[PDB]
Design an enzyme around this catalytic site. Sequence first.
Site, PDB file in Angstrom:
ATOM      1  N   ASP A   7      -6.643   6.208  -4.828  1.00  0.00           N
ATOM      2  CA  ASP A   7      -6.074   4.892  -4.948  1.00  0.00           C
ATOM      3  C   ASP A   7      -6.209   4.425  -6.384  1.00  0.00           C
ATOM      4  O   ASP A   7      -6.606   5.189  -7.265  1.00  0.00           O
ATOM      5  CB  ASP A   7      -6.686   3.900  -3.964  1.00  0.00           C
ATOM      6  CG  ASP A   7      -8.122   3.552  -4.293  1.00  0.00           C
ATOM      7  OD1 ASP A   7      -8.732   2.808  -3.510  1.00  0.00           O
ATOM      8  OD2 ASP A   7      -8.637   4.002  -5.330  1.00  0.00           O
ATOM      9  N   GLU A  11       0.781  -1.244   0.000  1.00  0.00           N
ATOM     10  CA  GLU A  11       0.000   0.000   0.000  1.00  0.00           C
ATOM     11  C   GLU A  11       0.811   1.293   0.000  1.00  0.00           C
ATOM     12  O   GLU A  11       0.283   2.355  -0.306  1.00  0.00           O
ATOM     13  CB  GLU A  11      -0.889   0.012   1.235  1.00  0.00           C
ATOM     14  CG  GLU A  11      -1.805  -1.154   1.305  1.00  0.00           C
ATOM     15  CD  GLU A  11      -2.976  -1.050   0.340  1.00  0.00           C
ATOM     16  OE1 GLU A  11      -3.760  -1.997   0.294  1.00  0.00           O
ATOM     17  OE2 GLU A  11      -3.137  -0.024  -0.363  1.00  0.00           O
ATOM     18  N   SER A  59     -12.259 -20.341  -4.838  1.00  0.00           N
ATOM     19  CA  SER A  59     -10.864 -20.228  -4.418  1.00  0.00           C
ATOM     20  C   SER A  59     -10.764 -20.587  -2.953  1.00  0.00           C
ATOM     21  O   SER A  59      -9.822 -21.245  -2.517  1.00  0.00           O
ATOM     22  CB  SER A  59     -10.379 -18.792  -4.592  1.00  0.00           C
ATOM     23  OG  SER A  59     -10.241 -18.464  -5.958  1.00  0.00           O
ATOM     24  N   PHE A 116      -8.079  -6.617   3.439  1.00  0.00           N
ATOM     25  CA  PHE A 116      -7.709  -5.231   3.621  1.00  0.00           C
ATOM     26  C   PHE A 116      -7.955  -4.452   2.339  1.00  0.00           C
ATOM     27  O   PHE A 116      -8.392  -3.325   2.363  1.00  0.00           O
ATOM     28  CB  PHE A 116      -6.227  -5.155   3.984  1.00  0.00           C
ATOM     29  CG  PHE A 116      -5.781  -3.807   4.464  1.00  0.00           C
ATOM     30  CD1 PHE A 116      -5.339  -2.854   3.569  1.00  0.00           C
ATOM     31  CD2 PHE A 116      -5.747  -3.518   5.815  1.00  0.00           C
ATOM     32  CE1 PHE A 116      -4.890  -1.608   4.017  1.00  0.00           C
ATOM     33  CE2 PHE A 116      -5.300  -2.303   6.260  1.00  0.00           C
ATOM     34  CZ  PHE A 116      -4.866  -1.348   5.367  1.00  0.00           C
ATOM     35  N   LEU A 130      -8.855   3.789   2.986  1.00  0.00           N
ATOM     36  CA  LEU A 130      -9.905   4.357   2.132  1.00  0.00           C
ATOM     37  C   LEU A 130     -10.755   5.334   2.941  1.00  0.00           C
ATOM     38  O   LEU A 130     -11.193   5.021   4.044  1.00  0.00           O
ATOM     39  CB  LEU A 130     -10.792   3.218   1.610  1.00  0.00           C
ATOM     40  CG  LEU A 130     -11.809   3.415   0.470  1.00  0.00           C
ATOM     41  CD1 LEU A 130     -13.220   3.305   0.967  1.00  0.00           C
ATOM     42  CD2 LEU A 130     -11.598   4.668  -0.376  1.00  0.00           C
TER      43      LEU A 130
END
Length: 164
Positions: free
Chosen positions: A20, A11, A117, A104, A32
Amino acid sequence: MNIFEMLRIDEGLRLKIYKDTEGYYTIGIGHLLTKSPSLNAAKSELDKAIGRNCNGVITKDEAEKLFNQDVDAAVRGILRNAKLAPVYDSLDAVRHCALINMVFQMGETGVAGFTNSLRMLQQKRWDEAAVNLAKSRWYNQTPNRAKRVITTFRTGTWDAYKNL
Ligand SMILES: [Cl-]
Protein backbone atom coordinates in the site's frame (compact mmCIF):
# COMPACT_ATOMS: atom_id res chain seq x y z
CA MET A 1 -23.42 6.18 -3.75
CA ASN A 2 -22.75 4.23 -0.52
CA ILE A 3 -19.84 3.20 1.67
CA PHE A 4 -18.82 0.25 -0.49
CA GLU A 5 -18.67 2.22 -3.72
CA MET A 6 -16.88 5.00 -1.87
CA LEU A 7 -14.15 2.75 -0.53
CA ARG A 8 -13.92 0.84 -3.77
CA ILE A 9 -13.00 4.13 -5.45
CA ASP A 10 -10.45 5.09 -2.77
CA GLU A 11 -8.77 1.68 -2.36
CA GLY A 12 -9.08 0.09 -5.80
CA LEU A 13 -9.08 -3.73 -6.28
CA ARG A 14 -6.01 -5.96 -6.63
CA LEU A 15 -6.06 -9.73 -6.60
CA LYS A 16 -2.39 -10.28 -5.86
CA ILE A 17 -0.43 -9.20 -2.80
CA TYR A 18 0.71 -5.59 -3.18
CA LYS A 19 2.26 -2.83 -1.07
CA ASP A 20 0.00 0.00 0.00
CA THR A 21 1.00 3.63 0.12
CA GLU A 22 2.98 3.09 3.35
CA GLY A 23 4.73 0.02 1.95
CA TYR A 24 2.69 -2.64 3.79
CA TYR A 25 1.54 -5.91 2.30
CA THR A 26 -2.08 -5.67 1.31
CA ILE A 27 -4.58 -7.36 -0.99
CA GLY A 28 -8.10 -7.05 -2.38
CA ILE A 29 -9.82 -3.82 -1.54
CA GLY A 30 -7.36 -2.25 0.88
CA HIS A 31 -7.17 -5.27 3.13
CA LEU A 32 -3.95 -4.80 5.14
CA LEU A 33 -2.27 -8.16 5.77
CA THR A 34 0.68 -7.19 7.89
CA LYS A 35 3.11 -4.42 8.71
CA SER A 36 6.00 -6.89 8.73
CA PRO A 37 8.46 -6.64 5.86
CA SER A 38 8.22 -10.40 5.23
CA LEU A 39 6.32 -11.44 2.14
CA ASN A 40 6.11 -14.84 3.80
CA ALA A 41 4.50 -13.45 6.89
CA ALA A 42 2.12 -11.78 4.48
CA LYS A 43 1.37 -14.96 2.64
CA SER A 44 0.71 -16.67 5.92
CA GLU A 45 -1.71 -14.01 7.04
CA LEU A 46 -3.52 -14.29 3.71
CA ASP A 47 -4.06 -18.02 3.91
CA LYS A 48 -5.33 -17.67 7.47
CA ALA A 49 -7.73 -14.88 6.46
CA ILE A 50 -9.09 -16.76 3.47
CA GLY A 51 -8.95 -20.26 4.89
CA ARG A 52 -6.89 -21.85 2.14
CA ASN A 53 -3.46 -21.96 0.56
CA CYS A 54 -3.63 -18.96 -1.72
CA ASN A 55 0.05 -18.55 -2.51
CA GLY A 56 -0.51 -14.81 -2.60
CA VAL A 57 -3.46 -14.59 -4.94
CA ILE A 58 -7.23 -14.54 -4.44
CA THR A 59 -10.40 -14.37 -6.43
CA LYS A 60 -12.81 -11.42 -6.80
CA ASP A 61 -15.36 -13.21 -4.75
CA GLU A 62 -12.80 -13.67 -2.03
CA ALA A 63 -11.76 -10.00 -2.30
CA GLU A 64 -15.40 -8.92 -1.97
CA LYS A 65 -15.87 -11.19 0.99
CA LEU A 66 -12.91 -9.69 2.86
CA PHE A 67 -14.13 -6.21 1.96
CA ASN A 68 -17.57 -6.93 3.37
CA GLN A 69 -16.05 -8.28 6.56
CA ASP A 70 -13.81 -5.25 6.88
CA VAL A 71 -16.55 -2.63 6.44
CA ASP A 72 -18.73 -4.56 8.86
CA ALA A 73 -15.94 -4.62 11.42
CA ALA A 74 -15.12 -0.98 10.96
CA VAL A 75 -18.67 0.07 11.63
CA ARG A 76 -19.02 -2.23 14.64
CA GLY A 77 -15.73 -0.90 15.92
CA ILE A 78 -16.85 2.72 15.72
CA LEU A 79 -20.07 1.86 17.49
CA ARG A 80 -18.31 0.33 20.45
CA ASN A 81 -15.60 2.96 20.62
CA ALA A 82 -16.17 5.47 23.43
CA LYS A 83 -14.69 8.45 21.65
CA LEU A 84 -16.10 7.64 18.22
CA ALA A 85 -19.62 6.46 18.82
CA PRO A 86 -20.94 9.80 20.00
CA VAL A 87 -19.57 11.55 16.96
CA TYR A 88 -20.88 8.95 14.59
CA ASP A 89 -24.27 9.09 16.25
CA SER A 90 -24.40 12.86 15.83
CA LEU A 91 -23.86 12.77 12.07
CA ASP A 92 -26.15 12.34 9.04
CA ALA A 93 -25.85 9.24 6.79
CA VAL A 94 -23.47 10.74 4.23
CA ARG A 95 -21.06 12.00 6.83
CA HIS A 96 -21.18 8.61 8.57
CA CYS A 97 -19.45 7.36 5.41
CA ALA A 98 -16.59 9.80 5.67
CA LEU A 99 -15.92 8.65 9.23
CA ILE A 100 -16.02 4.99 8.24
CA ASN A 101 -13.59 5.78 5.42
CA MET A 102 -11.07 7.26 7.83
CA VAL A 103 -11.37 4.34 10.20
CA PHE A 104 -10.98 1.87 7.38
CA GLN A 105 -7.76 3.56 6.34
CA MET A 106 -6.11 4.45 9.64
CA GLY A 107 -7.88 2.32 12.22
CA GLU A 108 -9.89 3.31 15.29
CA THR A 109 -6.89 4.39 17.27
CA GLY A 110 -5.64 6.62 14.50
CA VAL A 111 -9.00 8.30 14.07
CA ALA A 112 -9.61 8.58 17.79
CA GLY A 113 -6.46 10.79 17.76
CA PHE A 114 -8.17 13.56 15.74
CA THR A 115 -9.61 14.92 18.98
CA ASN A 116 -10.10 18.50 17.94
CA SER A 117 -11.52 17.63 14.52
CA LEU A 118 -13.94 15.24 16.16
CA ARG A 119 -15.25 17.88 18.54
CA MET A 120 -15.73 20.26 15.63
CA LEU A 121 -17.68 17.60 13.69
CA GLN A 122 -19.85 16.96 16.71
CA GLN A 123 -20.60 20.68 16.90
CA LYS A 124 -21.36 20.69 13.19
CA ARG A 125 -18.74 23.40 12.44
CA TRP A 126 -18.10 21.99 8.96
CA ASP A 127 -15.66 24.48 7.54
CA GLU A 128 -13.68 24.66 10.73
CA ALA A 129 -13.42 20.91 10.96
CA ALA A 130 -12.24 20.68 7.35
CA VAL A 131 -9.39 23.06 7.97
CA ASN A 132 -8.40 21.18 11.07
CA LEU A 133 -8.52 17.76 9.41
CA ALA A 134 -6.12 19.05 6.73
CA LYS A 135 -3.47 19.84 9.32
CA SER A 136 -2.34 16.24 9.50
CA ARG A 137 0.15 13.68 8.30
CA TRP A 138 -2.83 11.94 6.69
CA TYR A 139 -3.57 14.92 4.41
CA ASN A 140 0.07 15.42 3.52
CA GLN A 141 0.67 11.75 2.68
CA THR A 142 -2.53 10.99 0.74
CA PRO A 143 -3.84 14.37 -0.27
CA ASN A 144 -6.23 13.39 -3.02
CA ARG A 145 -8.02 10.83 -0.91
CA ALA A 146 -7.99 13.06 2.15
CA LYS A 147 -9.46 15.90 0.05
CA ARG A 148 -12.34 13.68 -1.00
CA VAL A 149 -13.13 12.62 2.54
CA ILE A 150 -12.80 16.11 3.92
CA THR A 151 -15.08 17.52 1.22
CA THR A 152 -17.57 14.87 2.17
CA PHE A 153 -17.53 16.03 5.81
CA ARG A 154 -17.70 19.70 4.74
CA THR A 155 -20.61 19.40 2.36
CA GLY A 156 -22.62 16.39 3.45
CA THR A 157 -22.94 15.40 -0.29
CA TRP A 158 -21.17 12.90 -2.63
CA ASP A 159 -19.87 15.56 -4.98
CA ALA A 160 -16.24 14.63 -4.50
CA TYR A 161 -17.01 11.15 -5.67
CA LYS A 162 -19.11 12.19 -8.62
CA ASN A 163 -17.38 11.77 -12.00
CA LEU A 164 -14.96 9.12 -10.66
CL1 LIG B 1 -4.19 10.36 -2.37
